Amino acid sequence: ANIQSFSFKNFNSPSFILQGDATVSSGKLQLTKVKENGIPTPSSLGRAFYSSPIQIYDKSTGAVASWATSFTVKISAPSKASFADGIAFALVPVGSEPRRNGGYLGVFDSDVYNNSAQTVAVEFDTLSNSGWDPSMKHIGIDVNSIKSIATVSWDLANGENAEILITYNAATSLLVASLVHPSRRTSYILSERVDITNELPEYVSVGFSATTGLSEGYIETHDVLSWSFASKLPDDSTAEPLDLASYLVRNVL
Amino acid sequence: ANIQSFSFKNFNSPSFILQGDATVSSGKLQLTKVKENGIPTPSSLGRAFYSSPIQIYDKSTGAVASWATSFTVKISAPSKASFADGIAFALVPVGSEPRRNGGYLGVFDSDVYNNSAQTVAVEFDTLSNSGWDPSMKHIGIDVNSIKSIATVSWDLANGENAEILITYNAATSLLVASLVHPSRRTSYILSERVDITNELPEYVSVGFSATTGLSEGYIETHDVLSWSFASKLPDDSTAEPLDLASYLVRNVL
Amino acid sequence: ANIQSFSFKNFNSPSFILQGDATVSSGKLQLTKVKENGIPTPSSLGRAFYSSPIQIYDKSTGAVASWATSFTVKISAPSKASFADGIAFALVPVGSEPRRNGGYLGVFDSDVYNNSAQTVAVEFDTLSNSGWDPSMKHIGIDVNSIKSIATVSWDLANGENAEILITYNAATSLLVASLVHPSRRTSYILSERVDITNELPEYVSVGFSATTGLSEGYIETHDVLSWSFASKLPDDSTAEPLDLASYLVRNVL
Amino acid sequence: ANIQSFSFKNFNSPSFILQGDATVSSGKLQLTKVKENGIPTPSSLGRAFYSSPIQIYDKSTGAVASWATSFTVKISAPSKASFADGIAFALVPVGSEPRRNGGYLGVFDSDVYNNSAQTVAVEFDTLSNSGWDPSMKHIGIDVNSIKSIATVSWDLANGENAEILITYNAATSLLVASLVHPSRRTSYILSERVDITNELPEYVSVGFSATTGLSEGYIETHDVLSWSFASKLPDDSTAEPLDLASYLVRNVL
Numbered sequence A, B, C, D: 001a002n003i004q005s006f007s008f009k010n011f012n013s014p015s016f017i018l019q020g021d022a023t024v025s026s027g028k029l030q031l032t033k034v035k036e037n038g039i040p041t042p043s044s045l046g047r048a049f050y051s052s053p054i055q056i057y058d059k060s061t062g063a064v065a066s067w068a069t070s071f072t073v074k075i076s077a078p079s080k081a082s083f084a085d086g087i088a089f090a091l092v093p094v095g096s097e098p099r100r101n102g103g104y105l106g107v108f109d110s111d112v113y114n115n116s117a118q119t120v121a122v123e124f125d126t127l128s129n130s131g132w133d134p135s136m137k138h139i140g141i142d143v144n145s146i147k148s149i150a151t152v153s154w155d156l157a158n159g160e161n162a163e164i165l166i167t168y169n170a171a172t173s174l175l176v177a178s179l180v181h182p183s184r185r186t187s188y189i190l191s192e193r194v195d196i197t198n199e200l201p202e203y204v205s206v207g208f209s210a211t212t213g214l215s216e217g218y219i220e221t222h223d224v225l226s227w228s229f230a231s232k233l234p235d236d237s238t239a240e241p242l243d244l245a246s247y248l249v250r251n252v253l
């Protein structure tokens, strides 16, 4: 079995691929632009990926990998400004370049399924786009389109940490994402079946993508304070889910 | 730092403490009694704990441990029978003996807070007891009483696997529990703050406790198919949450 | 696969089984007796094992486990006293009681192979017993007898830490033990093939056993300052060696 | 703490940086050239590194990382040919290009200490170079020069697997390397203190480098069959050795 994993409580550019306005400052990963006085900047777009590609599956052996990632983000909006646009954890083709800005979160080009996009992402959408978005702020699973295949309402706690955990079990083909705001003791979870070997390539780069709104008052920050990831690829078709117990304690807690 | 962990995909009595009707057959952990023909038995009560005690905290250093557990259970009710009574993951005093049967799930004595009970458990209640239970089937966090301090409705999928994950972060004092029915793509999550050092002793035994109903037709099985656990105790007061990413992949997926 | 592991940098009686003069003081594991003034006591014998039994193999599936343990010991002899008798890491039958004292290190009864003894131990012998011992101080692998099947000279550094690592690879049936005295930059290693399923039972208790000499001037201390262990049991006959890289960093370094 | 780790039992180019004649075939990592008929090629040179750089230390916090790597190599020499030149595990500057071939193993330029070389490597030298090499085949620790600072004789078993483990403990500043030939039950170990923060940069690329002899009959193959690595970087100066127990079982065994 092939295993790849990492856990960062402190960020330093070397081990990451930064695109757009993504930068590393004070050890945290800042996905979008921020003026010196601390206020967010509109029309921003940043992405960051682990410098090592991860093999999601192997066409020769029919083995599919089971993986998990956990990270803490802090989304803050200036006093009188509205939230926009959101951040997303994504699996993209190794060479991939940023896509449309604004409501596309820098990972998709349209709200129409396009298998050739070869991108899967779990988004934390802070602005409802009338053309494909649910009524309020939400968490959603996007498979080759910005129109999520499943969503769940989310009560964003401005300025308070959000602890996220996303897992994929090759045995049940189930992708699950949960978010927790410790400060408020609120928690949200969402799950859906995703045939990964059909929506993505054998190798992908894992990371984040965030964008701020295209208007003067639709802004927010996107700071990743810590990030963990672990992947396991078997040798036969026989899938083996991961050990989350041992994972979180050895990585998140 | 002190660490203790284990992951069982196959059960064998030696490493576990069995009480009541709990038994190990065909490698799975069967908490309640079952007639030879496969049908569940009423008025049953079984418990099982890892043979090694786990230190939840240290009074001398002020360090509190962060831990996580994940397991898969299959709860089945004969064709025309009703569900009862439920199973619970619990932290109990090392020498502890089973308590009241029936709706008390074998871990509590009353629906009134009794700090001296020194027991905390996350229950998966399949029968609503008018005196302290919510309207329907639910997941709840019990702190020294059978009346949960917080609950969440749960749509039990008869005979289908339930993948559970419970975590405790010493930094936020937050206890979170989530349940997923892969077969139905449904998922539930629930969280609440719990001052562990006040509700439990320094050392505890971790395991399960399940009971069936006290009537002829209120029965169900309680098979644990796999179980993982991991605990980390720091050396100073400074708490450190676990790495769930690395945990699940190295343990659950 | 079944996994069991733990790592203690600080000791506390609850999770261990203590026999003889073994005690836990100031957080370290003291295997042999020591007078209040700090000097060792002759004719001492202490043993300590993890409170959870470990399954070395499964007769039904033909699976053999691969495991590894690492610990730091400090062996000190008063100014003008001679060294005796040694400490040993051992795998013994779950219910096992201490055996002969003195040169038998509390784990064996004779220097003649007795399969029914069902004990395997890696010893760090500090006193040469004319009847079965090599010329000087040594590390040896004992399989059901106090006469090691293989040994290696060892230059004990009085009062300086010794970092030990012992591993067993089910695939090569090879047992390897290495000792390092960081302070002196000296290192020793020793390896031998051992058909474990023939020399031990399915379940064993892992721990230490140490004894001091039976004479007024043959004494030394045996303090274990930290201890790690990890075991993995597959589901088919197909053995899988462990990941020492990930093991030491996640446990020893 | 920052952690990075991986374990490959099967190789696939994507996650690695290949230089020279290094190639991935049949899943194994072949460092040097080999004719289609299977015989090795002279004057060869290949290198391979994990695609993600690893931070060995942080100048700002004074924290030094503790790491460990384990891999299996198979060195074979055609019937009537002599061995040359060797393989080496090395830590090199992130952008680094191969160096001198032949007896320099592709990582060094001279047998004279040159701190600016910023390279540390543990070599498995199969050919004695009169100008800086010990009498026979050996394992050695090279710090910015091809003249090892310490060596140990090694009896190479032609065509038989060699299981290697190299560790670095930031607390003792000790680098230890051990080699085992399971087939022969032989084992070798070697250790030396190395002030890493003085010999290497903050970030390095970890991998292998191998070369064959510059003559018609001095050849041998260099196949890496599996490779594990794990690194842990603390947040304060306080170093913390790794858990090799948990590492090997979770990675090597």
Ligand SMILES: Nc1ncnc2[nH]cnc12
Pocket (backbone or CB within 6 Å): A165, A166, A167, A168, A176, A177, A178, A189, B163, B164, B165, B178, B180
């Ligand atoms: N990704 C996930 N988040 C929360 N609970 C889970 N249970 C299983 N996978 C999970």
Ligand SMILES: Nc1ncnc2[nH]cnc12
Pocket (backbone or CB within 6 Å): A163, A164, A165, A178, A180, B165, B166, B167, B168, B176, B177, B178, B189
């Ligand atoms: N116990 C838990 N279950 C699901 N998601 C979580 N996220 C953090 N802890 C969790």
Ligand SMILES: Nc1ncnc2[nH]cnc12
Pocket (backbone or CB within 6 Å): C165, C166, C167, C168, C176, C177, C178, C189, D163, D164, D165, D178, D180
């Ligand atoms: N137990 C052990 N000690 C030292 N080096 C090893 N290499 C493999 N197993 C080992």
Ligand SMILES: Nc1ncnc2[nH]cnc12
Pocket (backbone or CB within 6 Å): C163, C164, C165, C178, C180, D165, D166, D167, D168, D176, D177, D178, D189
């Ligand atoms: N790298 C290493 N190889 C073998 N035994 C060891 N003990 C500690 N570090 C070691």
Ligand SMILES: [Ca+2]
Pocket (backbone or CB within 6 Å): A085, A086, A103, A125, A126, A127, A128, A129, A133
């Ligand atoms: Ca949107």
Ligand SMILES: [Ca+2]
Pocket (backbone or CB within 6 Å): B085, B086, B103, B125, B126, B127, B128, B129, B133
């Ligand atoms: Ca009830």
Ligand SMILES: [Ca+2]
Pocket (backbone or CB within 6 Å): C085, C086, C103, C125, C126, C127, C128, C129, C133
């Ligand atoms: Ca002796």
Ligand SMILES: [Ca+2]
Pocket (backbone or CB within 6 Å): D085, D086, D103, D125, D126, D127, D128, D129, D133
């Ligand atoms: Ca040479």
Ligand SMILES: [Mn+2]
Pocket (backbone or CB within 6 Å): A123, A125, A132, A133, A134, A140, A146, A147, A148
């Ligand atoms: Mn959306």
Ligand SMILES: [Mn+2]
Pocket (backbone or CB within 6 Å): B123, B125, B132, B133, B134, B140, B146, B147, B148
């Ligand atoms: Mn209830």
Ligand SMILES: [Mn+2]
Pocket (backbone or CB within 6 Å): C123, C125, C132, C133, C134, C140, C146, C147, C148
């Ligand atoms: Mn001996």
Ligand SMILES: [Mn+2]
Pocket (backbone or CB within 6 Å): D123, D125, D132, D133, D134, D140, D146, D147, D148
């Ligand atoms: Mn050399």
